[PDB]
Amino acid sequence: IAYQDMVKQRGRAEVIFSDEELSSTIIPWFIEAMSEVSPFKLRPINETTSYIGQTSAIDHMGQPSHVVVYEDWQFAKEITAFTPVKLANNSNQRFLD
Amino acid sequence: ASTEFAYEDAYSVTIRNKRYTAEVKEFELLGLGQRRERVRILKPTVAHAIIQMWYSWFVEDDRTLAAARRTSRDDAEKLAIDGRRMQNAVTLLRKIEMIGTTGIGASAVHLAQSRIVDQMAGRGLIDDSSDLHVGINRHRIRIWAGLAVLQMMGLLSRSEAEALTKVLGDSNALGMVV
Amino acid sequence: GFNLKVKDLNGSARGLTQAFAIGELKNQLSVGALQLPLQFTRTFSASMTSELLWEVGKGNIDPVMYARLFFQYAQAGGALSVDELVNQFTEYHQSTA
């Protein structure tokens, strides 16, 4: 999908041409860059859609009249309420009571 | 990522060709004094997104269901549409009203009535307050309380809840039903 | 020096009717025949006629005296409420201590 995004905006794809070698030896670290630091951490495609359900309405035979895709979500538990306290002026440092 | 915690709202009503209006404050809804302005609320971005799922159905449907009745000349097609419109409109009312009875919602309703009746003692006879307990005004004050409690939490934008009411009023959407 | 006519209370002084105090402002007044008994031995009242000077010590940090003063502060002239007076102290005391 990222390729699609890129090619939409760029309209071309150009290379540093340091390959065939360079980016094969240096870097896979594109992988390392992706592995540790990022919040996007790598998952099996099985375990990504675990929260999604799907349900069809129907007619007599039947083909669906109404089809609804959803994410199973849980509400609550609490709603937090606080008063911020500034320890030093000009800064965002705060205790939140 | 957080929000200033304050809310103001007012329920208005006409009784015997006379209008009384009560305004209400957040700390009053939680039954305390005086008021502490310094406190804030953590925005419930998650919870809000869920109720949105409801909201976007109601409004976007009614909107498209309206433009549907214009393009539909056929009377058999039209009698179904206005059915579905009113149908889920009452479901909305049934929902909000349900919230209107809550720790806050009922505490909300009491405050309005209290301030209205105290308003009814001075301005004239109180005896007209009998009308507040009539079927419709009672359902009226309840819905309001419902939308008001939702707003005084991160759950309802005032801009979207107003546009929610327009849906509820665009279709008459009150079966009085005894 | 408040004068009132005893026959009609609601007319003379509405404010002193018990009827008012419990929240019935309607023509209806409390029904003279109803149920259950009681006797009051004691009550909670403040003192009249007292003007006192209270020293605040070297130390000694009298935990009641301050809590007593806070009340006198909110009382003897309005400063919010003695509830709102405390959570002001917490924010000061957090921002400082």
Residue A7 contacts residue A13 (beta carbons within 8 Å): yes
At residue A3, the 3 state secondary structure works out as: helix
What is the separation, in whole angstroms, between the first and last Cα of chain B?
47
Interface of A with C in 33-92 (CB under 8 A): 83, 85-87
Q: List the single residue in C26, C81, C91 with the smallest CB-CB distance to B33.
A: C81
Broken C–N links (> 2.5 Å) in chain B, after residues: none
Q: Does C55 touch chain A (CB under 8 A)?
A: no
Instruction: Measure in Å the smallest separation between the Cα of C60 and chain B Cα atoms.
Output: 31
Question: Would you call B32 helix, strand, or coil by DSSP?
Answer: coil
Nearest C-alpha in C relative to A93: C95
Residue B14's H or E segment, with its range, is: strand B8-14
Number of other residues whose CB lies within 10 A of the CB of residue C69: 13
Question: Which contacts (CB < 8 Å, 24+ apart) does range B74-83 have?
Answer: B82/B171
Instruction: Among B42, B48, B151, B156, pick the best mutation site for testing chain A contact (most A Cβ within 10 A).
Output: B42
Q: Beta partners for B2? A: B42
Distance CA C71, CA B9 (A): 32
Six-digit token pair at C72?
Answer: 């006198």
Residue C45, token pair as written in the block: 């009242």
**B42 contacts chain A (CB < 8 A):** yes
Length of chain B in residues, anyone?
Answer: 178
The Cα B153–Cα B146 span in angstroms is 11
Number of H helices, E strands in chain A: 4, 5
| Alpha carbon of B40: minimum distance to chain C alpha carbons (Å) | 14
Mark yes or no for CB contact A87/C95 under 8 Å: yes
Helix axes B75-100, B45-71, angle to 10 degrees: 160
Find chains touching chain B: ≥3 CB pairs under 8 Å: A, C
Residue type, C92: Y
Cα separation of B34 and B146, whole Å?
24
Taking one residue from A and the other from C, the number of pairs with CB-CB distance under 8 angstroms is: 13
CA-based nearest residue in chain C for residue B118:
C25
Residue B25, by phi and psi: left (phi above 0), alpha (psi -120 to 50) or beta? beta
What does the alpha-carbon distance between residue A45 and residue A35 come to, in Å, rounded to a whole number? Answer: 16
Is the sign of the CA dihedral B105, B111, B114, B118 positive or negative? negative
Longest dimension (CA), chain C: 62
Which among B70, B95, B83, B90 is positioned nearest to B167, based on CA atoms?
B90
**Test mutation, A74, A83, A92, A95, chain B, max B CBs within 10 A:** A83
- B168, B166, B148, B167: which is closest to B158 by C-alpha? B148
